Structures are given as C-alpha cells and as structure tokens.
Symmetry: D2
Subunit: 359 residues, 4 copies
Amino acid sequence: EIPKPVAPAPDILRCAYAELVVTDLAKSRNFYVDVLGLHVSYEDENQIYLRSFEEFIHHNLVLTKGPVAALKAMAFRVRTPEDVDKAEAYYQELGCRTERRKDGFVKGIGDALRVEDPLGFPYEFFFETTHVERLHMRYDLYSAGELVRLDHFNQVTPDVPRGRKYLEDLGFRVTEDIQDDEGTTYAAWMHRKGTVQDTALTGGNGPRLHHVAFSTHEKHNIIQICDKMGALRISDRIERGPGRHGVSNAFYLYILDPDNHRIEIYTQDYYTGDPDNPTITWNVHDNQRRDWWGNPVVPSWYTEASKVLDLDGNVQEIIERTDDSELEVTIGADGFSFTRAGDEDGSYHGQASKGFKLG
Amino acid sequence: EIPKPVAPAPDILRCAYAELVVTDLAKSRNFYVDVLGLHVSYEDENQIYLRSFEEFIHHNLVLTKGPVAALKAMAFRVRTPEDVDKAEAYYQELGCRTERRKDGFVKGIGDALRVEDPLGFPYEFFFETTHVERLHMRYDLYSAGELVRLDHFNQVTPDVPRGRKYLEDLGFRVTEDIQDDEGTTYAAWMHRKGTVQDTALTGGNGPRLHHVAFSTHEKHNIIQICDKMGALRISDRIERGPGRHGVSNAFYLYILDPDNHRIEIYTQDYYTGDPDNPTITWNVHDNQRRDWWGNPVVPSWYTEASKVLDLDGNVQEIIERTDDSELEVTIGADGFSFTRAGDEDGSYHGQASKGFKLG
Amino acid sequence: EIPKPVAPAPDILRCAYAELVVTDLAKSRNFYVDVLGLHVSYEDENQIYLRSFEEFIHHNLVLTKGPVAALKAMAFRVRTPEDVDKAEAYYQELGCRTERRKDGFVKGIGDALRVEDPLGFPYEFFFETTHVERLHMRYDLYSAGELVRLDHFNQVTPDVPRGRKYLEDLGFRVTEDIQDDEGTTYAAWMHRKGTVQDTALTGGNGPRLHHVAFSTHEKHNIIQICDKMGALRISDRIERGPGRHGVSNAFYLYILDPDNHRIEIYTQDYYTGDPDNPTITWNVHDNQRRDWWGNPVVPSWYTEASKVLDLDGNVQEIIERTDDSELEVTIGADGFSFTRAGDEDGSYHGQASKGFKLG
Amino acid sequence: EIPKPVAPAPDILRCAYAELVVTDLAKSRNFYVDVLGLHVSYEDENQIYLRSFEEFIHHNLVLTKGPVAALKAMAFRVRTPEDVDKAEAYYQELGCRTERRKDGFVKGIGDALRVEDPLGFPYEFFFETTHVERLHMRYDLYSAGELVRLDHFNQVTPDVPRGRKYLEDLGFRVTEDIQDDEGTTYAAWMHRKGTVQDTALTGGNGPRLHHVAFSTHEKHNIIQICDKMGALRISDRIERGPGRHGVSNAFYLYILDPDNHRIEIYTQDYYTGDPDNPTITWNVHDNQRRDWWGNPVVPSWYTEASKVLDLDGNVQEIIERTDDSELEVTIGADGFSFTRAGDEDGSYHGQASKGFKLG
Ligand SMILES: [Ca+2]
Ligand SMILES: [Cl-]
Ligand SMILES: [Cl-]
Ligand SMILES: [Cl-]
Ligand SMILES: [Cl-]
Ligand SMILES: [Fe+2]
Ligand SMILES: [Fe+2]
Ligand SMILES: [Fe+2]
Ligand SMILES: [Fe+2]
C-alpha cells in the first residue's frame, strides 16, 4: 500500500501534455500532422511540439526522437507556481525519485518537476507555460477530423486498487470502474477537470502507457478519421472502433502511430464536477461496458501498450498482473460475457461477441 | 444463361416495398415501430403496413403473420399502368409462373403482378398505390434515428453472373461488383433509381433474402439506432457495424428483427443516374471492400439469410453455391486479405482482421 | 405561349455544369478552390475547370476570364449522343438560335449544342464528356465544408407560367411552386434526375442567373462554410442563411463569389422520381415557405442576379417583370406575411419577420 | 461600488436550476416537455420540475404557476453544506435581504439560502439535493433535439462593470467581454465550472433575466429544434438564430416560451478551467462578435427580457441603463458595424447587416 503523505497534494488542474519518444521523427510527423491534423507549435530535427485546436498552452504532445519508443513523461498542469513545490515535497515524502528544472524539461514549459511515481510512471507537474495563439475560431485551418482538446491518459498497472488509492490521495476522484462479483477490479477512471477522466487505470502488466486521448467536437469528426485512414490505405492502423463506450458514454476510436503508441479519439462524455457525482460500477462480464453496442474488444487492446521511461531514459521493468485478466474472463476460452445479466440469449462463452474468437 | 426476351422489359422506377412473413406480429411491431420508428399506414390482427418518413406511397414494408418467417414479395414500382402488362409478358416469355391481381395482393396497392423469377425470388410489379400523407416535414414526429426512405433489397443467389445478366436485361445497371483474379464473381449491385442499388446479389445458397435497407439523413441517425439498442439492452440484435462500406461508400449498420430478418440502415451513397456511370470492381481479398475501415465481416453475414416463398406460400428450395465462398477465401482457414495490394504488412492469412478468427 | 414542338424533346439526365465568366481569374480561384475546396480538373491562364467530390464527368463549373461577369452557359447532360440531335431539331422548331460543335465549346466536353432558349438563356446539351477520377472516397482530400455534387441552377425570368410550360414540354416535371390567391405565380421548381430540382424559375427581371447550387453530405458541412468565411473575415459574402427551406425541405446557404455570382449550398431534399410525385404549392405570404424557421429573406436575394450571355458573348437585354414582386408583397412597405394562415398573431405588415424592415 | 466582504465567498460549483413563474402551467408544460423534451422529475397542479438528459440533481428548471411571469430564483450549487452558511454571512455583510430555509424553497432541494442580491436578482445557494436517475445513456428516451445540460443564465443589468466586480469577488472569472474604444462595457461572460459561462451580464435596463441556456450534444440537435418549431407552426417563437457566436464560439439559438421567457440552446464552447485562461475582448462594432457569420442581431434581443421577483414575490423595479446602448451604437440610426476593422467595404451605417434596418 502507498501511504497518504502528511504534505498537501499539489492542486492538479488537468492533464496537459505527453512526451512520447519516437524512432523516426518524419514518419511520426506524417501521422500526427498530416494524417491527424495537429498544429505545430515548434519543431526541429529532434522534436515536434503539437497542440490541439482549442489549446492556449504551448503544446499537448511532444514527439522526441530516441532509440526506443516509449512514454517519456505524462504532464499535469497545477494551479499555481507554488503547487510545483508542493508536488516535490509530496513525492519526496512518498520516497520517490524527483528531478526539478527551473527552466523546464521541454520547450514552452517553465519550472517543472518530474517524478518516478509509486507505480513506476514518469509524471510531470508544472504551472508555467508559454501561451500561444488559441486556434479555436480558426475555421480556415479546421480539419474534417479536427482534434480540439487533449482529454486524458490511460495507464496499464498490475494492481488497480493500489493505484486508485494513490491517485485519490493525489486528489483525483473516481467516476467509473469495472469489477466482478468476487471483488476483483479491472479498471478505474478518475478526474480532476470535471470530465470523466484525466487519467485512468487499466489492469495489466505495467507500468505501460495504454493511450493518450484527444477530443473532437462531434461524432462525424471521428468517422472522418476512419474514412481518411481508409483513403490513405492505412486502415490496418485502426486498432478498434469506432464505437460508443459504456464506461464514460463517449464516442471513441483507437488508432496506432508509427511506433505503435495508441491514440484514442473521444467525444461527448458527461460533467463530473460536483463533489457527489455518482460513481458507476460495471460488471466485467457486461458486454456493453466497453463498447455499448456489444462489438468485441480487439485482443491487442488488452495485451499491447507502450513502454515507459525512468528519469535516466531507460525503460522501466514490467511487473506482471496476478489478479484476473479482463481478456481471459470475457473473451478467452474460459471467458464469458452477457448482453442482459442472467440471460443465456445474447451471451458469449469461450469467444467474443459477433461471431469471433481470439486469433 | 437466362435468355433476353423479345418482349420489352417493364420500366422499373425503384424498389418500393417488401412483404415479410413474421411469426409474432406484436413482437415484430415492437421492433419496427417502437425501436425503429417506422410509421404505421394501417394495421390489423394479421398485418402491419409501415412507411418511412419521406414516403408518399402507401407503404415500404408489410409485416404479415404466418407460420414460417420468410420473404413473401419484394416489390418494384413501375412507371405506368401498362408496365404491369409488360412485366407479365416479359416473365411469361422467360417461362416463369405469374399471378395477376387487378386489385392487388396487399392493401394500398392496386393492379399488381407477382412472379416466381428465374432465380426463384418472389417479385411484385405494380403502378397503382394509395397515396398517404408525406411526412417529410413532420419534424414533430422525427426520431433521432429516423428512417427516411426505403433504399434497396439484397438477394442471396448461387450464381451471380447468371443473375446479373438477367437483371441487366430487365434494365438494372451494375454499379459495383466484387470479383477475384480467377474469374469468380462474389457479389454485384445494380440500380434503376439514381443511387448505387435497388437490388443486389450476394453469392451464396439461395434463393434467400439477405436484407432490406432503409436510409437515414445523416450518419448520427445510424449511431443513434445503435445507442438506442444498447439502452434497450438488445445490442445482441446488432449484427454488424456500424461502418463505412467500400462498395457503395455508404455509412451502414446491420440489425436483426425478431425472426432474424436482416435490416440494413444506410446513408450517403452517390449518384449513378448517368448511363455510362463508371462500374467499380473490387477484389475479394481487399480488406477495405466491405468495411472501408478494415473491420472484419461477421461470419453470420455470409451464412445467414431469410427463406423466400413461392406463389403458393411454400418455402423455395435452396440451391447450393458451387463457386468459391467469399467467407472461405477471405476469413476462413485458407483465406487471405490485404490492406495494400502487394504488401505483406497489414495482410491476414487464415483469419479475420483486427485480431479475430471465426468463432 | 411557347408552342410544343412536334419534334421529340431530348432526354435530359440532369444539370451537369455551368460556365461562368469572371473578371479576375486568380481572385475567383481563391474563392472556389481555396475557400470552397472544389477540385481542379484543368486550368490555364484563361480558364479553371472544377468538379465536386463525387463527380466523374470532367467538370461541374468552368470559370472563364472575360470582360463582363455573366453566365456563358448552363449545361445539361442528355442520355445518348442521338439526344444532341434531338435537342438541335427541337430548338430549331422553336425558332431559337443554335450552335453545334462536334468537339465541344469547353475542354472535356465532346459534341455539344448551345442554344439561345425561348427565355433568353444560354443552354447547352451534350452527351460526350471526358471521365476523370471520381473522388468520392478520397477522404484524404475531403474538406470540412466539402461540396459533393452539383445540384441545380436557378433562373430569374419575368413570366413564370410561360417558362414553366416550356420547361414541362422539354420534359422537366414541376415539384413545388409559389402562388398567391390572385392567380400570380412567383416561382417554380422542376426536375429531371429525381431530386426536387435541376433548374428552377424565380420571378423577376430577366434573363438573369439567380444561382448555381452545390450539395454537401450533411448539415454541419454547410455550417463549416459559414464558420470558415467568418474566420477569413469575409462574412459579408454570406448573403443569406444558413436555413431550412420550406420549398424543397433542404438545408441551405447563399454566398457571393468575387463577381457577385450567387452560389447556394444545399443538402437533404427528397426523392421525386415517381411520375405522380405529389406537387406542393405554397402561398407567397407564408413566412415558412422560403425559410422554414421564418427568418427573413434578405432583399438582395430578390433584386440581384447575374447577367447572361448570348451565343456571340454579349449580355442579353433584360425584360422587366410586370407581375407582382415577391419582395414587395411580402417584406416591402405594403407587404404581408403570416406564420399561421388566418392568424394575426405572428403576422408581419409592411416589414420583414424577426423585427426588421428593409434597409 | 459593491465592496468586497471580509466574510469568505461561498464556493460555487455551477449554475444548477432556475425557477420561473408562468401564467398557464399546461401551456408551459406543452413547451418545455412536449416541444423541448425536458424530463419530468415531479409535477402537480402548481409546479412542474424538469431536468436535462445528463443531470443527476433533482431538476434544472422549476415552473411555478403565478399571476405575473417572472424569474423567481436563479440557483447555484455550492460545494459543501457549510457554503450555504458562508453565503448567508457574505450577503448579510453586503446588506442584502436574505431568507434561509433548512428544508428548501422547492421540492428536491434541501437547506437553501435565497437573497435579493446587490443587482436586484433573486439568487439561491444550496448544496443538498435529491439525486435522481441520471438519464445520460437512456437513448430510448433521447430526442432529436435533446437538451443535455443546463449551461448558464444571462442577466440584464445597467452597469456592467459594477456587476462584474461583484461577481468576481464572488469567485466568478471573466472569460469574454464586449467594449468600445471610449471605455464602455456592453456585456461580460463569467464562469465557475470551466466552460465560458455560468452567468453573464448584458448591459440594459434591469434587473431582468435575459435567458436561461441549455446545451445539446451536437449542432444538428439545435437545427432540429428549429425544424420542429416550423412543423408545429410556431416559428414566430424562434427569436434569433440559429448561429455561431463570436463571444463563446458556441452554436446557438434563442426561442421564446409562452410567457416570453427566452431560452437559449447552446453547444460547443471551450475549456476555461485554467486560472490564466486568456480573456477575450471584442469591439462593440465588430459585426462578427455576436453572430460570427455577420447575421443581424434581432432588436428584441436587446430590448426584451423577463421581470424578476423579490423575496416577497413582487416584481423588482427596473433601473434604466445610462451607458451607451449596444443596439443604438451598432444597428440604430447613428450606429455602425464592420466586417473588417477599418474597411468601409462590408461596413453598415445606420442599419443592420444583410440589407435590413430596425422595424
Ligand atoms: Ca486468386
Ligand atoms: Cl473501452
Ligand atoms: Cl458489405
Ligand atoms: Cl428560398
Ligand atoms: Cl450574442
Ligand atoms: Fe480512454
Ligand atoms: Fe445493402
Ligand atoms: Fe436553389
Ligand atoms: Fe447565452
């Protein structure tokens, strides 16, 4: 268990950006700029800094050339400069490795703290950032698939309750989760900014980064991303979807960048800012929990995720999940799922929905 | 080969309605009226007559109670009264059984001809029909999932080229087809009204009715049907989709009625009314041909379809397809599909796309 | 009265393209290509040939540099080469000037007939056209405002019944019209291809070209055009809309090109292809007939329209309308409109709706 | 000036509900339930309690039968029970009349404080509320025009800077405003929940309630409300729109209920939750500030608004604005607006845009 520090948690506003290590910067640029239409805040031969349509901070995504594709940092903005000091004292009390840079780790960020957190993830906390032109009314630039906000991160970790408790002490509030009747937790979603999630935990071998999620305005914008990928003959890089989520109620799509980093496109979840916001727990065997329409969850969604780096830039050792596997209990040979709880009609045993088994 | 008659083909306007035999009229009403929102033109203890939002003829769908669920008639409207006589002479020349009723077979249709066509399907030709209130601006009635038009039928038949030639002689023009490089045709689409299809042929054991398709205005209307089916906890009745088709370029969904009759929801195909409209041939191994995003085609889509009746009300005998199976050559154990022609990367050998095998 | 020829009418398929004379080819290119996203089939120093997303014929719009901005030709495609001969015989019997060129008047059109028609309009009829890449699945090119089809023309002419009879003899079928209770006709809509219109007549001084209309897939595509024009700070070139039409039921927008040629953007009218398609007549004083939401029709919509050329390239003389003016009887100082017939509440006397008078 | 209390401000979460007095409860029910599709949380012969699709608190709107149509209370939810005490001490220090009811003023609200605030408005502050079924995934109940959240209030007050400072002291942060070069403020928008606004100030005679605003998911949902009002032949109750706002960037519509209370329908503004969220100031003469497409602002929008009640149920005296009138300076006889600053082309002098003058 991870103890609650005496020191106050930093006041976290929201997820703000991710730094991803990529192996071929030009191929990654093609994906994020030419395919997905993100906006360049800065670039050179080593890095590309990208932002969404409605953003005013310097960036939502930094692509950094390196030898091994991995998550380098997932960054949260905090409310005040003093909250960076609070973050440092908090993670020091947790016994975590920290590194403080008064002029930032990446361009367009000022005083910043990076930590190897108790779950092995590289978190950054910062307040100071260079403001840029907010493009929210630049409809002369608007793409049919425009990505308008950074919405959330999702992390793979082996013990979800342990991670959940730690994030709760850090001020995140749980909105939704997936459990079974004999007390296993498979996933949890948690927020600071008044949407369903700023980060989320997926049970599995970790630390690994499951995905980074961007929003669109409308569902048709997500459809267009799929259509464009078909036209570019890269439909093999559409991993899963499009769909409606059960958990979060958002319309969604998962796609894979050139290094296999997973990107979710997302829209139209609900407001969670009231302190008594009702939590929702789904049963793991409910075949509408992940895709509301009952479409099968592609197996790579459960098995594949990105490496994460420590503060020296080396890959973090993976620790194996010992709790039950969501894949195995739902779509594996001994798994099952239901459409209506207790009804054999519309249930699936030893395979996925819609007539498929695992390949 | 089916010969071209000397007698002139009737001038067919469009698909107009289907008559489906259903086993439980109330259960069927719940699906088509309460779930899908079709508009009742007439009903009694034996039949329900339904129409789409923009229709002015009496109905697009007749549900008739009977002992064995089946297609009873797929009806095409012809341009003039005299075209019903032309239809009769044409099919008599073809050696087909015909039945003429001056006051119709169903309510709201006048003089009508039903035939057992050379592929064993029950076709109706009529001109006369009772006009009803066209609901096209009745936005006080408009559903978030509103079905606005009848679009097409799709027929399963064992020998696609044989059927195609017959339909071309009858005046349908082929818009798209699926073939391989070994001379096999797997499917064809053909039209009279200015859209991709009024009917279509899917290779398989037949005669069977694959589906009846209705249009929506927009893609979000199809999304809503999925969402509603999730809320009603009948997502098991979503067979396949939603998706973007390769062939037709339409956004689509396939759902199953209480008797397992398959309904497609469809929008935003293209204009085909010019007589030299370019005919598009897709390769059967192209994994973007059916779902442009590369999502796998559910196996029941290839195997399951509705019985059809002869003019005596008895089920037509099924003739087995001897040409290659689209399922087998694409997603079966010796199948193959590609994302990019000539690229091993993004190809699938002996399984479906997105990580699945046949259940 | 324009007499009905003995000679048969050519079988007209659809509206196909317009040739507009523009004064500054680069400024016009910026509007049609950069702002509106139409696709270039061919260009040089004198002409730009443009097509919509789903078109396979060579072009839908030819911009020709010249001294006076005007319609040079409105072109309809006919069913067969022999229909060009029929068109020549038909217009010769009407006593109209004709000009036939076996190799066309513009690039990408073959054997073509241009005529000075009985209403003074430069019509072209052609069958032969160079096929080009149909861009209907080129979602890598798809704009958030994508124009997908050419839909119709709209002509200003002083005597609507006279023009209507002539177009009916030519094979166009009236779908909707606007009249009053004193026997005046203000406008009529008429089709060949099975949508509400291929051309339309607006009562007014003429011959003048009121607009050319292009379709989008969805309503949000029309909204985007507005949004983009706001971002480009050219909202002054949004003339009227966006709205829902009463007549046609289509979602719409009117914008102005650099020479003040009016372009409509249009979507989601209804099917008219049955020969007994019900006609709809609106009263001119019904304030939902042009904008279903009751928004006022901007006065320039009634007063402004483009010059048209004769076959020698000179502007056609304008003949004044003597029938009552739709502007005057609805929104002028002695005008009237209603929301509900017979109800003083929601009616407008001597002013437009929503609190406005004419500027 | 309204001095800042030494007592701490209550921690306000968001706008939560309005209580409107209506004169004919059944007619009001028709509008809000049958036309707009709001969901009933409770009703009797005197009151109707309504909520939006995604709400979990008891209601977002209370309709109360009474003799004079008016705003009875605009309610904000506070973070904790203790914040109701804080509100009481805060307004007592300001010298305002307050009333505390430990069991609430309306059903489904617990301990609540109502105040006659320094601008004459009846504010309520509460924490405790009865949770109800959150309908966010009840797609079986979803309307084509579904209202999904309560978004904001908008208040008419004569001195915008005076009101702005008072609301800033209360914790609201300004996101956008409208000013001129002479230093007049015409309007300001301010938030607690991390959208553009929870309440807003429009310069004018007050206190009056300008509107209550509900969100939709998508722009097409707003279009449907218009279309439905057309079909119900109540387009005269569409006051203004639909449009895109400049200020807020939201897609919008204004409609009028049976007592002329104005309701805005709204979607797709941007995130404001960072503490240094950039504040946007628009010039009053910018014709894209209110409608981004330059459509004219209906004069009733500037002149008409609802009465508000004091705590005895009597109408508050209305104080006239002495600062310049936005109507007069933009669309009145001595007003002007521009499309591009400094360009006479696309400017309007002594009249509105798009060819209209004041009726
Ligand atoms: Ca082969
Ligand atoms: Cl999921
Ligand atoms: Cl398909
Ligand atoms: Cl109009
Ligand atoms: Cl506004
Ligand atoms: Fe996610
Ligand atoms: Fe189909
Ligand atoms: Fe038009
Ligand atoms: Fe507002």
